[PDB]
Amino acid sequence: SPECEIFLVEGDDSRTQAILPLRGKILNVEKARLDRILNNNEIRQMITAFGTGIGGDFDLAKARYHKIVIMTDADVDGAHIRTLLLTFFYRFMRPLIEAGYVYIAQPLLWETTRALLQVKLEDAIEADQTFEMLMGDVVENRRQFIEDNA
Amino acid sequence: DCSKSPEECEIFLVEGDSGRRTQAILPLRGKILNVEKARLDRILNNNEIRQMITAFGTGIGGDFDLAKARYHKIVIMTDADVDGAHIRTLLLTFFYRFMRPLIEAGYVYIAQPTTMNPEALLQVKLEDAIEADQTFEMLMGDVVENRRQFIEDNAV
Amino acid sequence: INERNITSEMRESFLDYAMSVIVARALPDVRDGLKPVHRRILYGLNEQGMTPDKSYKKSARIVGDVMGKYHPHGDSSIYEAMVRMAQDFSYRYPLVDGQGNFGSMDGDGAAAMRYTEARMTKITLELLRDINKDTIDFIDNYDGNEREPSVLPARFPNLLANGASGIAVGMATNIPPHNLTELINGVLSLSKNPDISIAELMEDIEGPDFPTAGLILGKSGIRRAYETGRGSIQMRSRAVIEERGGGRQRIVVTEIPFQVNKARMIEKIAELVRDKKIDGITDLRDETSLRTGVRVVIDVRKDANASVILNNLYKQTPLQTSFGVNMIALVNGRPKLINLKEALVHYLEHQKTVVRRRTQYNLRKAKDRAHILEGLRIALDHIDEIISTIRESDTDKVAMESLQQRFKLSEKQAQAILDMRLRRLTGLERDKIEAEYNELLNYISELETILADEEVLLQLVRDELTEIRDRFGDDRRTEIQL
Amino acid sequence: NERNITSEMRESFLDYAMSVIVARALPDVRDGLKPVHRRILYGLNEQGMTPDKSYKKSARIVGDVMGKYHPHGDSSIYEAMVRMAQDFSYRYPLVDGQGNFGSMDGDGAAAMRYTEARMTKITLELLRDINKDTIDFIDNYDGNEREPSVLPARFPNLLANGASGIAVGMATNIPPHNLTELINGVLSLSKNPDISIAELMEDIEGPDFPTAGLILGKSGIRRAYETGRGSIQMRSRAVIEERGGGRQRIVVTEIPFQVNKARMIEKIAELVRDKKIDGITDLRDETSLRTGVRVVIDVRKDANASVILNNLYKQTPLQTSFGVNMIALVNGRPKLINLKEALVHYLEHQKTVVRRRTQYNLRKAKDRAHILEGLRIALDHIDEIISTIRESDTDKVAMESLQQRFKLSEKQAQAILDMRLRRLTGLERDKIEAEYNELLNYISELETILADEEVLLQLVRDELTEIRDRFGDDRRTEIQL
DNA sequence: GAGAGTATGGCCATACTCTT
DNA sequence: GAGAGTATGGCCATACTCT
Ligand SMILES: N[C@H]1CCN(c2cc3c(cc2F)n2ccnc2c(=O)n3C2CC2)C1
Ligand SMILES: N[C@H]1CCN(c2cc3c(cc2F)n2ccnc2c(=O)n3C2CC2)C1
Ligand SMILES: N[C@H]1CCN(c2cc3c(cc2F)n2ccnc2c(=O)n3C2CC2)C1
Ligand SMILES: [Mn+2]
Ligand SMILES: [Mn+2]
């Protein structure tokens, strides 16, 4: 029964727990066009793992897992990978986050995953504005944000 | 690969490890297959063996042709250590079993310990067909006991 | 001619490699039980001061140190060797303490050196104990810049304790691991009576003791191995037939054979049920956890005989496997097939020699110090004249000569007087020097006794071995049936 | 027990971005080093791997840096170390390597196992005076070790070797420069703070790339120095050689900075195959250690080699632009700086380093003098000193008695107790006095430097001149009119 | 049938910014 | 364009002997 769980892990529960390792930095879907996105092997592995499909063909019912956990390193690059993965979720599988199936693990493994935080999306408009600014193509917006918070 | 005559053309087999037109380089990563121990299907499936056959482009065994030779000089350049020696023996086994005529034609050389710059290579020459056949079988063959005996008699 | 004979090249090149793989790669030393790569890893940890008390160090730093300093080979070779010494299922008495994924019984290797960390174990200290007391010989490393141990002091019998498994050229070696308590007891027995029989040694050493436990079938195989240095020992998994109500049955496997890949064994049994090679199984499960240890559960079909099916598995899968003993070790730097007694005799001699050398070293130091103290004693008794002698002298060379000629003292003693600090002139310091000298005289006598009488030296070896047995020796894990 | 998506994005992004800016991709204005480089250099220095001693295996250097200072992948550390060893990459290389460290053809260096390395003679000048309280030390990632926040950098490394980093929000691209020219400009600036960029340019003519070549015009450079941003045209050194029967050839002896030689050749070859360029008969690379770079292109009998050569500049990386973008870390924040600002900040680093070293030497000198004054007292009254000690039961007692009787301090009494009997000889007695007399003179010199700021500034000038004379060399890149 | 353990290193993708 | 340079590591084959 999917009512099992999958862990996305950056660096190095048999019945109910699944593990998918992600070597390297994930592609930024906000910067890339669809043909590139769909050809990325790490992206394709993730799509297949969930089996919900992307964009319009998304089916919440056809989800393999009700708990998807982003377990990344406790360093700065961990954070970056975290942002990249959330970008993919927001742009291609938004209803999953709305269904509350996505989680972020806090403290790189047995004693850890345990603390998991639910990813919740409150504002559609704010998030859209945030994603485009942080992950988008326009450099200057990103620089300004750094400036003001630096 | 090389930058027309095979006479001027020389190829270097290197165990991985600057300053070279005819000179060609083929690097061999890892230990080479022992052809004395292996059957034909395994031999031909070895990537490193296949690369060498293609490089020379003379064919093997029955179909071997001296005229087809891409390079007139073949140099075994391996590391100056114990494993270098082992790779050297393995490569010579392949030549003796599959391209005997090349050694007879004196196209094979061994580089000794800046050497590539012409500003020494030793010729491999085959004096006795019978002794070599006996020696190869004893050193590279399947019977372990013969190999042991050789070590015992010549040790240290 | 600038030409080389093909037969001459083959013979020379082959021999170079074969000899090197034999005396410096694949075969362990009889005295310390270590192949060159292992010795270098252990010594490298010791030299970098990575001990059980201090924290774990990054594997890339250990490997890089060993590579630069002692082992001129690929990093992956050094790391993989270090990993095995850290594995509880591989080493009966592990020599490396690791942090992170160091692999498991399922064949899965350790995480890359970048993600792993390590330090030496408490027992490894006993291999290195007294290394700096001229107990063993040091040779130059590959480049000449460093020095390294030719062998380690090895205060416990490591070759038999942890065993050996190496493939050379012309030969190979396969020595099973043993219980430390049993070994030391056998060693003490042998020291008492040099003409002890292998039968008599077997009263102490019952057989091999594998870290993975399990069961050895019969003592007949073990006897041949110990007497001749060669033989075959049957190893079978610990499996029990568990009963459920209405005659329902299951097989549970709690221990497996040594060096047997758990994952591969499972896949082979699965292959037999798929291929209809074995009939009577409903489900095969692996419930192995860190808490429970190894747990392999096989559920039997109703009204099928579990005893019969279990026995088929021994005959068909690595649930029963043989260990083929082949005891070749390096003895006087040449390979040799040795029996159990020869192994024990050589190790005992190493201990005798190590202890002799340590005692001789301590004596040279003690005597040197005493000689120095005798001079200092003279100076403190005649301080006023000593001081005047120095002050009257224009240079240190002059004072040295004058101190020697006047107070009938040696060059070493005169040097020591010049180097003396003014604080040594106090009451306490004068009494301290005397108390050191009195104690030192007593100690030199103790050392001299050990070196004179061979029985005293032999007793000291016994005493030290006993201490190791008491501190590190543990229960026998492998059961010998019948 | 829930996390907002907008809150995670903003927090996580900023954490990474700021880290990549202030501790990965951008160099410091004072020493011109990104964190990985500083750690490699300091690690060489701590392990004692200097030019005089032998080459050490790369796996040992990398492993040391990783364990001690840089908690990142071994390949990142090694690749950084490699670039500092490459003569085509660094105008003044900071690492001396043995084995294959790559070439101009884009060929990577062989794996860490097959290479070995040590620091260069110039690198010593970056580390000079590090142990004299000249720079600040911080704790490393785990707390077990301490590491330099910046290096003393006795030569102006940021401009000398340049920088090329891609951050987040921003990036940096600083070209390399001639050291003689730089120092001359530095001395010029120190004499007169009101100097113009035009006036600085009389000393510093422009960038000097290790790969030589040519810069087309002063126009792009001037904008770059004045504003900190500019595009500079770099063209290969080519000659049209005239042969028998009207046949011609083009010969290329220098290529642009950061341009892959092999890839350039492949680009020309693609143009002849695809018929996008007409006239070329044969393309050869005769590059050797004796000749340096030698690329020969044979022109057809009919073809005007001038025309073809000009087409090649327009079509291939035979002519390439360098886009200057001078962002460095100034007070630990990123800042776009012009040429004068770069020189001003480096000069201040030197002034501060020299001042701090002088203050350190003074503390030591005074400590030693104070000690010597005590030792002088003891030698004058030795007989009483000796009796005072002998009468005392413990060292604590002798200390107290020596202080109370001969008006000595605790440090002076300690030193007297620690005195070795050999100090009582004629030469040694005279040595102590002669050290004291010299030390008094030296303290005055140090005191002068600290009182007058002009004396301190002159000292900086003098030391920079010495570096210029020892390490400075000829300009390689020609700037064309 | 295999696989026990020391030896002999390339090849792959992505983030991020800037550009005749 | 694509590539300038620090960051985030697994996958491949062979020798050699022995039941
Ligand atoms: N399918 C792709 C995804 C990850 N990957 C990869 C990983 C590399 C590298 C080079 C790579 F191609 N690579 C090249 C140099 N260093 C590394 C390195 O550390 N890594 C590891 C950390 C991710 C292959
Ligand atoms: N699944 C394991 C069980 C034993 N086995 C095996 C055994 C071999 C061999 C080759 C083998 F693969 N093998 C190959 C050549 N000679 C032998 C040989 O003597 N034996 C020993 C058992 C008799 C693989
Ligand atoms: N020709 C290529 C394909 C086979 N090969 C190879 C090489 C390895 C490895 C594992 C390998 F598969 N390998 C695995 C672990 N260490 C090594 C290793 O050092 N090497 C290098 C020295 C030979 C080299
Ligand atoms: Mn990490
Ligand atoms: Mn080698």
Rg, chain D, Cα only? 30
**Sign of the CA dihedral with B26 first, then B29, B32, and B33 last:** negative
User: Burial letters for D314-328: b for 16+ Cβ neighbours within 10 Å, e otherwise?
Assistant: eebbbbbebebbbbb
Give the one of C6, C11, C13 whose C-beta lies nearest to B125's C-beta: C6
Which residue of chain B has the CA closest to D103?
B18
C-alpha to C-alpha distances, A135 to A44, A88, A94, A130, D168, nearest whole angstrom:
20, 11, 16, 8, 11
| C418, D421 contact by CB (below 8 A) | yes
C-alpha to C-alpha distances, C59 to B71, C111, C113, nearest whole angstrom:
46, 11, 5
| C359, C450 contact by CB (below 8 A) | yes
Whether residues A11 and C115 touch (CB distance < 8 A) is answered with yes
Residue B48 assigned ligand-binding role: no
Domain that holds residue D208: 1-481
D78 φ, ψ (degrees, to nearest 5): -60, -45
Question: Does residue A140 sit within a domain?
Answer: no
Minimal C-alpha gap between D114 and chain B (Å): 8
Q: Please tell me if the CB atom of residue D108 comes closer than 6 angstroms to any atom of ligand 1.
A: no
Minimal C-alpha gap between C234 and chain D (Å): 43
Q: What is the dihedral of CA C434, C436, C442, C444, to 10 degrees?
A: -120
Instruction: Provide the token pair at C247.
Output: 């005659």
Tell the residue number behind the tokens 């590279």, with chain if given: B140
- Measure the CA–CA gap between C423 and D402, rounded to whole angstroms: 12
- Measure the CA–CA gap between D373 and D290, rounded to whole angstroms: 64
- Measure the CA–CA gap between D57 and C70, rounded to whole angstroms: 11
- Measure the CA–CA gap between B18 and B84, rounded to whole angstroms: 20
Experimental method: X-ray
| Catalytic entry in B83, B131, B133, B142 | B83
Phi-psi group of C180: left, alpha or beta (phi > 0 → left; psi -120 to 50 → alpha; rest → beta)? alpha
Cβ atoms within 10 Å, residue C105: 19
A98 vs D contacts (CB less than 8 Å): none
Comparing CA positions, the residue from C208, C212, C272 lying closest to residue C89 is C212
Rg, chain B, Cα only? 16
Domain that holds residue B84: 1-156
- Measure the CA–CA gap between D237 and D258, rounded to whole angstroms: 15
- Measure the CA–CA gap between D232 and D209, rounded to whole angstroms: 12
- Measure the CA–CA gap between C102 and D293, rounded to whole angstroms: 50
Question: Does residue A10 sit within a domain?
Answer: yes
Residue C249, judged by CB atoms within 10 A of its CB (0-12, 13-18, 19+), counts as buried
Comparing CA positions, the residue from D162, D164, D151 lying closest to residue D119 is D151
- Measure the CA–CA gap between B152 and A76, rounded to whole angstroms: 60
| C258, C236 contact by CB (below 8 A) | no
Tell the residue number behind the tokens 């060498």, with chain if given: B52
| A42, A24 contact by CB (below 8 A) | yes
Question: Does residue A89 sit within a domain?
Answer: yes
C-alpha to C-alpha distances, A72 to C224, C324, D3, nearest whole angstrom:
56, 46, 16
Q: What is the 3-state secondary structure (H, E, C) of D2-28?
A: EEEHHHHHHHHHHHHHHHHHHHHHCCE
| C288, C296 contact by CB (below 8 A) | yes
Comparing CA positions, the residue from A133, A136, A50 lying closest to residue A95 is A50
Q: How many domains does chain D have?
A: 1
Contacts by A15-21, CB closer than 8 A, 24 or more apart: A18/A49, A18/A65, A20/A45, A20/A46, A20/A49
Could you confirm whether B81 is annotated as catalytic? yes
Instruction: Provide the token pair at C470.
Output: 């008491």
- Sort strands D248-254 and D295-299 into parallel, antiparallel or unpaired: antiparallel
- Measure the CA–CA gap between B25 and D253, rounded to whole angstroms: 26
Residue C278, judged by CB atoms within 10 A of its CB (0-12, 13-18, 19+), counts as middle
Residue B17 assigned ligand-binding role: no
- Measure the CA–CA gap between C390 and C399, rounded to whole angstroms: 5
Chain length of chain D: 481
- Sort strands B121-125 and C3-5 into parallel, antiparallel or unpaired: parallel
CA count, 13 A, side-chain hemisphere, D336 = 12
- Measure the CA–CA gap between C260 and C292, rounded to whole angstroms: 19
> For residue C25, what is the DSSP state?
I
C-alpha to C-alpha distances, D301 to B48, D104, D244, D297, nearest whole angstrom:
45, 32, 10, 13
- Measure the CA–CA gap between D189 and D290, rounded to whole angstroms: 41
Q: Kind and range of the H or E element at A120?
A: strand A116-120
Could you confirm whether B137 is annotated as catalytic? no
- Sort strands B121-125 and B108-111 into parallel, antiparallel or unpaired: antiparallel
With contact defined as 3+ CB pairs under 8 Å, the chains touching C are A, B, D
C101 vs A contacts (CB less than 8 Å): 12
Which residue of chain C has the CA closest to A11?
C115
Q: Give residue D105 CA to ligand 5 midpoint distance, Å.
A: 26
In DSSP terms, D147 is beta-bridged to D138
- Measure the CA–CA gap between C298 and C282, rounded to whole angstroms: 8
Question: Does residue A97 sit within a domain?
Answer: yes
Q: How many domains does chain B have?
A: 1
- Measure the CA–CA gap between C57 and C100, rounded to whole angstroms: 12
Q: Please tell me if the CB atom of residue B29 comes closer than 6 angstroms to any atom of ligand 3.
A: yes
